[model samples]
Structure formats: structure tokens, C-alpha cells
Target: VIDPSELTFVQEIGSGQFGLVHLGYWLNKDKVAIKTIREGAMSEEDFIEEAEVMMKLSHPKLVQLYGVCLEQAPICLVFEFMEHGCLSDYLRTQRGLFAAETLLGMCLDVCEGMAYLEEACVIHRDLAARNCLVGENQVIKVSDFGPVKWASPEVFSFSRYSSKSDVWSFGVLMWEVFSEGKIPYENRSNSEVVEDISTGFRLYKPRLASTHVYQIMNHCWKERPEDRPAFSRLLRQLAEIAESG
Candidate 1:
């Protein structure tokens, strides 16, 4: 557990419906990321459930949850700070800095993390570049919690999620990475995206993506949930691609 007095705020890093994340100094020493949940935004039961799930997960490519501050107003969660911030923003700002092989490596990092979650039988339900953080050495680590805007067809239509559906979201993240953070289906409404997704439509190939890379994205969008490649297979494929480059 983390004490409220142990943290000193630096600056707000990000914010959304769930809470605000801040860059902070823990123990007035080590820099860390602190997520402050809005009071009453989540029930105590739900908070404990989510915290347990996070506590049980650990991987090099997954953001580390250091501890929690539950005995106070606006509960806070401490996490390792990612200097480069979110993958989406990093990709946009450092577009020309990374070559195709480097981008493939980033995908492999995420694949490894998701593969761990798959083995753990946990469905991320929301896996996208925007939800991933980039730390030193351009290492990509998956972050965020719960459902996001980039829901799979099954998730959108019936509120169902499986590893396969997460595969679909991973495909979208690949597109975002290769496209330098272009939003999927730009200018389309949420309902339109849902309609198009249900009808088997997918985002167009990113201009910079190789034919092989785009093919992987297409494989993830197979209408049959069982048809998508597992994260293990994705890791192998991405490794081969990286090695070949």
C-alpha cells in the first residue's frame, strides 16, 4: 500500500472519465505515475476487483502497478513512469525516427504482453496503441483498464469479449502504429464504425505498411472469432519479420 503523504504531485499527465493521471515523485524521491480515481466514480467492490486483476499481472511489456493508496479521499494507484508517454503520441512525434523493423519490434513487445495475458486467461478487451505506453529504449508496454472506444464486433453488439476479440483490437493497434496514430475510420461516427465493423469492413492498409504487415491485420479481422491468430503466433511472426529485416 502507498500512503497519500508519500507522494508529491508534479503535473497532470492525462485524464479521462475514470480519473486523472499525474507525474509525481514518490517518497519525495523516485519519479512515478499516479492515477487518482474520482470519488464515487467506481464502487469499492469494482475497485478491489480491478486492483486484484492488475496485481496478478506482471510482464516486461506490461505497465507495473507499484501499489495503491486506498485509505484516503480520491484513491490513488502508483505505477512506473513511462518517459516517452503513450505509444500513439510517441509514434506521431517520432514518426521518422523508427524504421519498419523498429516498428515491428514494438508490435512484438505488445504481442508478448498480450500473450502473457492470454495464458493468464485475462481478456484485455481494450488493446490499442493509444492504451500502450512507451518507455526508455522505445519499449512498448500495454496499459489502461476496462473497455475502450475501440470495441470488437462481439463486444459492441453483445458486450462480450474474448482473446479473439482482443486480437481484433490488436489489429487496429497495428494499423495505428503503422499509420503514425491515424484514428481508424477517420470522420466516421461510432455507430457507423460499428455498422461497418459488423459488415466485415476494416480500415485500409496504412501507406507505410508492407503487404505482409497489412495481411496480418486482415487475419485479425476474420469474421469467425476462432479464425484470428493467437498472440503466440503473432509474436513468432513479428519476430521472424524483425529478424529478416
Candidate 2:
């Protein structure tokens, strides 16, 4: 059990879907990004820890959760500090800097994490690299779930959030990484994107993405969600590419 009063608060880092994120130090020396549960919502037992498997997840690639401070007003979920680095903006600003192998390595990193989640029987509803819109978090919106261009057809069309849908998002995320964070469907409105996807239009390959990589992305975009490549297989596919290069 963590005590919020003992934690060292440094500064405000961000506002998340959960709440404001703070840069802090916990456990004497451990650096943390503490995310509060809800703004101005005082905690009760339910708010403290209704207990989600989301809390139990631990992995090298996935953002790590350090601990939760439940005996407090905000009910802080202390996460491993990820810096201010967003994969999306970094790719954009640092374009042409990372070699193709480096890009592949980054993709493999995500692939393995997703594969683990797949095995764990979890559906990650928020799997986008996520610079596809105005604000990263909101309750009211077009897709009503998440990043627009990164959305799988099933998720966009039917709200069918599943592991297969995460595959689709990973495909888009891969493109974002390869393209050095070019916004997918950059010119279109969400309504246009929605229709274009329904009619089978898809994001084109980034200039740096090899045809083989594009093919795997195409597999993720297959009309039927079940036809999407399993993250387990995607891991092997990416691993194979890493070996060849």
C-alpha cells in the first residue's frame, strides 16, 4: 500500500484519459508518473481498487505500473516515468534520423508486448500511437472509443473491441512509426475516413516501409477482423525481418 502523502510531487506532466499525470518520486528513489483516477472525485473503496487486470499487467515494453496509492483522495496509480516522449511526435520531429532497422526494432518492441496481451486474453482498447486527432482523450467523439485512423473496421463500425481490433491498430501504429509519424489519412475528416474505410480504402505504405512490411499491414486491414494476423504471428513476422537485416 502506497501513501500519497509520502510521495514527492515534482510537477504536472500531462492530462490523461484517467486524469492529470504528475511527475513524482516514490519509494524514496523511484521516479514515477502518478496518474490520478478522476479530477476532484474523492475516493471510496470502489474508487480505491475495484481491481482491474489493467493494474496487474507488467512488462518491459508496455508502460509499467509501479503501484497505486489507494488510501488517498485522488487514488494515484503510479506508473514508470516514460519521459515526455510520445512515439507519435518523436517520429515526426525526428524523421529521417532512425534507420530502417531501428524502426523495425521499435515495431518488434510493440509486437512482443501486444503478443503477451493477446495471450493474456486482454483487449487493449487504446492501442494507438495516437496523434490522429485534436485531443488524445475525451468521452464524446466520432468513433467514441479512440484514435480515428488507427481504428480497426470492426471497432469503428460495430464497437467490437477485441484482440483482433488491436491488431488493426498496431498495423496503423506500425505505419506511423515507419513513416516517422505522418498522420494517417492526414487530409480527411473523420466522416470521410469512416466511409473510405467502409469502402475498403486503406492507408498507403509510407515511403520508407518495405513492400513486405506493407503486406503485413495489409493483412491487418483485411475486411474481417478474424482474418487479421494474430499478434503472436506478427511478432514472428517482425522477428524474421530483423534477422534478415
Local accuracy of candidate 2 as per-residue lDDT tens digits, 138-205: 11011112166778877777888889998898888888878887888989998789999889898898
Clashing pairs in 2: none
Q: Top lDDT: which candidate number?
A: 1
TM-score of each: 0.93, 0.86
lDDT tens per residue, model 1, 25-60: 887667889888897788877877888789888989
lDDT of 2 at 181: 78
Candidate 2: count of backbone clashes, pairs at least 3 residues apart or interchain: 0
Q: How many residue pairs of model 1 clash at the backbone? A: 0
Residue 222 in candidate 2 has what lDDT? 88
Report clash pairs, candidate 1. Answer: none
Ten contiguous residues minimizing lDDT sum, candidate 1: 145-154
